Enzyme design. Structure first.
Site, short mmCIF file in Angstrom:
data_model
loop_
_atom_site.label_atom_id
_atom_site.label_comp_id
_atom_site.label_asym_id
_atom_site.label_seq_id
_atom_site.Cartn_x
_atom_site.Cartn_y
_atom_site.Cartn_z
N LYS B 118 -10.20 -3.34 36.08
CA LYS B 118 -11.37 -3.49 35.24
C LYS B 118 -10.88 -3.99 33.88
O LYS B 118 -9.93 -3.45 33.33
CB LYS B 118 -12.08 -2.15 35.04
N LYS B 216 -22.27 -5.81 48.01
CA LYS B 216 -22.17 -4.35 48.01
C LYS B 216 -23.27 -3.90 48.97
O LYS B 216 -24.45 -3.94 48.64
CB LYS B 216 -22.44 -3.80 46.60
#
Ligand SMILES: [Mg+2]
Ligand SMILES: [Mg+2]
Lengths: 316, 316
Positions: B118, B216
C-alpha cells in the site's frame, strides 16, 4: 587481541568476517575483512589461516588500521563522519539492466553527477550506453579492469561521439600496466590506476604514467597512496570494495577526511555499494540521499548496538 | 429468505455478518457481507437498513450471487475449488512491520512471486521497501488507493531503480480517475483499475486508459468485468476484500474458475488475507502451501459443520 564474527552477503553468496581488535591502551574497534579471490586476493579461509601462522595480508593490515580509527572515535564518542566533508558517490551502472528512458534524469535530479561503467564485453554496446549518459550531461568513469589492449583502446576512444569525450572523467586500468602504453593512453583520456596499482615500481619511475590513483581503504595503504598523489600532483578517488556495510562506512569515512584535508585533489567517490547485496542487519541502519551516504547512528563507524550484540570468536 | 449471523474480526475490531440465503427450490447457501466504510462503502448497519427497505448494494447482490454458487455446490456435494485451476496469491507486506533478512528470500523459495504494497503514507519509507522487494527478485503491486496526483505520481516512478521498475507488475489507482491523466500514466507503468472502477464511463470510452481490471468478488459484477476485459483485451486480477474466511474462500473459488476458463488473461490473485485477522473458528480450518490456499474440508466454500452449528436470524 583479534576476534571475529562471520557473515555471508547475498548479491541482489559471499563470505567475510567482521573483526574486533583490542589494544594495550584499553581501546577496541571494529572493521571488515572481505576478500575477492576473483580479483586476486587470497580466500577468506587462507588469509585467516595465514594469520594464525603469523603472516598478515596487506588487506588484514588495512582492516586493523581501520579498526584503530574506529577505536579512537568510539573512545571520544564521535562518528567517523564528524569533521569530514560530505562527498558524492558515482552511480554504478550494470549492463545487465535495461536502461529505462528517463532513468538518467532520475539520477541527475536526485544529485548524481557521475556514472561508472564496466567496459570490456561489448564495445559497440557499451559505446551506445556512453552516448546515452553523455546525452544527459552526466560525467562517466570507464573501467576496463585491464582487459583491453593499447590498440583496441585507441580505436575505441577516437571514435566516440564528440559529446562523450569531454564527459569521461577518467578510464580505469585500460589494459595491463606498461609505462609507455599508459603514458600514451593519457593523450586520449585521463587514466586511473586501480587493480594495476601493485605493478607500478614507485621507487623507480621518472614520472607518473597516469592521472588518478584509485584508493580502496580495504586494500590500499592510504598514507602511501596520498603521498604518491602529492609527489606526482595527481588526483585520487576513494572506493569501497563491494564489501560489508562496515567496510562501506569505513571507506566513506576515509573519503570524507581526505576531501576535508585535500579538497580539489579528491574526486567523487564510489563507496555507495551496500545496495549490491540483499539487506542484512547492518545495511538496515544505513540511509542515503541520492549520491550521499547519510550518517548512521552511533560512534566510530556506528552500528554500536549491533556490534556489541555479536559473539566474537578469538582469532589471534 | 435471507438470515444472518453477526461476527467481529480483530486485526493482528471489524463487524460483518455471514448470510444464509434460501431459495424457493429448497437450496440454501452461505456468503459473507463485510463493508469497508473506510473505502467508501455504506456501513454494515446502513446496508442492512437499506436492505430491509428494499434496496441491495452491489456488495449485497454479490453476497447473494456467491451464496447461490455455494448452495448449488452443497447440493452437488462439491467444493467451490473443484474444476478450477489453482492460483498463486501475492504476499501483502505491511509498512508497520520490519523486514528481517532472508524473509522475502524465504517467501520466494516457497513459491511466492509478488508482493503487494500500500502506498501513500510515506513515499520514501515505502520506496526503500520496494528496493528490498526488488533485491529479492520478486514482482510488486503498488496500491495508491487514488490518494496521489498526476504530478506527485510521475515524480515517484522515474526515481525507482533500474532493478525496481521492471519488477512493478502494475500500479493500482495511482490517483483519481481521469482519462487523459491515466492514459499518460500508462507510460510510466501498467495501471490497474480497482476502487475507481465506478468512475469509468464504460459505454462511452474510445479505448481503455488502464491495463488491468481488479475484480473483488465481494463487490464487483464479475460477468460485467470479464466482458470489459475481453472487449479491450486487458488482464484481470482477482482479490479478496480483507474480509471473513468465508469471503476469502469464495474469492479464491471465483479466481480458480476464471483461471481455468480464461487462462493467461488471469493474473496472480490477492486473496490470501485470512492471516490479517486473529484466528476464529473459520480461519482455523484453512491451510496454505506457500502462495496457495488449500482446499478446506466440506462442500460449497466448506465449513459445513460450523455454518450448520450457527443460529441464523431472519433478515428479509
Ligand atoms: Mg576498478
Ligand atoms: Mg486496491
Amino acid at each position: 587481541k583479534i576476534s571475529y564474527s562471520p557473515y555471508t552477503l547475498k548479491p541482489v553468496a559471499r563470505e567475510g568476517v567482521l573483526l574486533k581488535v583490542e589494544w594495550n591502551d584499553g581501546l577496541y574497534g571494529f572493521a571488515d575483512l572481505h576478500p575477492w579471490p576473483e580479483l586476486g586476493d587470497l580466500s577468506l579461509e587462507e588469509q585467516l589461516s595465514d594469520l594464525r601462522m603469523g603472516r598478515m595480508t596487506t588487506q588484514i593490515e588495512q582492516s586493523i588500521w581501520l579498526a584503530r580509527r574506529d577505536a579512537l572515535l568510539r573512545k571520544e564518542k564521535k562518528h567517523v563522519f564528524d569533521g569530514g566533508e560530505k562527498i558524492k558517490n558515482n552511480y554504478l551502472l550494470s549492463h545487465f539492466q535495461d536502461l529505462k528512458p528517463g532513468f538518467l534524469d532520475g539520477l541527475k535530479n536526485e544529485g548524481y553527477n557521475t556514472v561508472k561503467v564496466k567496459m570490456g564485453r561489448d564495445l559497440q554496446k557499451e559505446a551506445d550506453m556512453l552516448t546515452h549518459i553523455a546525452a544527459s550531461g552526466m560525467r562517466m568513469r570507464l573501467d576496463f579492469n585491464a582487459l583491453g589492449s593499447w590498440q583496441t583502446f585507441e580505436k575505441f576512444m577516437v571514435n566516440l561521439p564528440l559529446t562523450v569525450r569531454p564527459l569521461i572523467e577518467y578510464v580505469e586500468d585500460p589494459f595491463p600496466f606498461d609505462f609507455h602504453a599508459w603514458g600514451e593512453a593519457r593523450k586520449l583520456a585521463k587514466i586511473a590506476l586501480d587493480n594495476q596499482y601493485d605493478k607500478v615500481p614507485w621507487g623507480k619511475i621518472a614520472s607518473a604514467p597516469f592521472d588518478v590513483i584509485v584508493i580502496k581503504p580495504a586494500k590500499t595503504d592510504v598514507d602511501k597512496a596520498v603521498a604518491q598523489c602529492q609527489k606526482w600532483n595527481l588526483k585520487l578517488a576513494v572506493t569501497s570494495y563491494m564489501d560489508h556495510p562496515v567496510g562501506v562506512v569505513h571507506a566513506v569515512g576515509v573519503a570524507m577526511e581526505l576531501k576535508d584535508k585535500y579538497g580539489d585533489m579528491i574526486l567523487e567517490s564510489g563507496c555507495l555499494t551496500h545496495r549490491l547485496y540483499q539487506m542484512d542487519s547492518f545495511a538496515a541502519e544505513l540511509s542515503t540521499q541520492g549520491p550521499y551516504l547519510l550518517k548512521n547512528k552511533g560512534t566510530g563507524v556506528g552500528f554500536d548496538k549491533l556490534l556489541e550484540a555479536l559473539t566474537w570468536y578469538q582469532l589471534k
